Design a protein around this ligand. Structure first.
Ligand SMILES: COc1cccc(NC(=O)N2CCC[C@H](C(N)=O)C2)c1Cl
Ligand SMILES: [Zn+2]
Length: 140
């Protein structure tokens, strides 16, 4: 579990969105595993606007933040889960690291701010849904 709180927005993995998130929907994209809902309180996270390929992510299954090198946002095949059939997920970045299902929502960050959130994992790999191209998160 986990979310990004920037301005009056809450950014969560679409497969973990609550009824309240769907009832206060701003934007959602199944192909990216993202959903954004509106909030009453202002958040403190800042979104990175950069092309960093190194950062640090939070792993709930180890209570630890790990430094990692990660690939550029791309279209990657993800195996069938209980939330999605086997499909191509877009705007996904891969890194070597520990990840279990419940690790989704963990923040990945660089020197400029929040880069994305854990979305996939498995066999010594961890996937992140990129948010740096969503410029509208910084306004309205
Ligand atoms: C023990 O680690 C494993 C082993 C096998 C599969 C997975 N689960 C995923 O990667 N997810 C599930 C949620 C939905 C994601 C998605 N964005 O499609 C995929 C993990 Cl983390
Ligand atoms: Zn950066």
């Amino acid at each position: 579990s986990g979310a990004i709180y920037v301005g009056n927005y809450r950014v969560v993995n679409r497969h973990l969105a609550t009824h309240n998130d769907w009832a206060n929907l701003v934007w959602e994209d199944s192909s990216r595993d993202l959903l954004v809902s509106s909030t009453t309180a202002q958040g403190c996270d800042t979104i990175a606007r950069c092309d960093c390929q190194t950062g640090v992510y939070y792993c709930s299954s180890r209570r630890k933040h790990y430094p990692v090198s990660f690939s550029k946002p791309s279209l990657i095949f993800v195996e069938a889960s209980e939330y999605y059939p086997a499909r191509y997920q877009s705007h996904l970045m891969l890194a070597v690291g520990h990840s279990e299902p419940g690790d989704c929502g963990g923040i990945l960050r660089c020197q400029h701010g929040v880069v994305g959130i854990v979305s996939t994992g498995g066999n010594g790999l961890v996937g992140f849904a990129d948010v740096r191209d969503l410029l509208w998160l910084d306004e309205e």
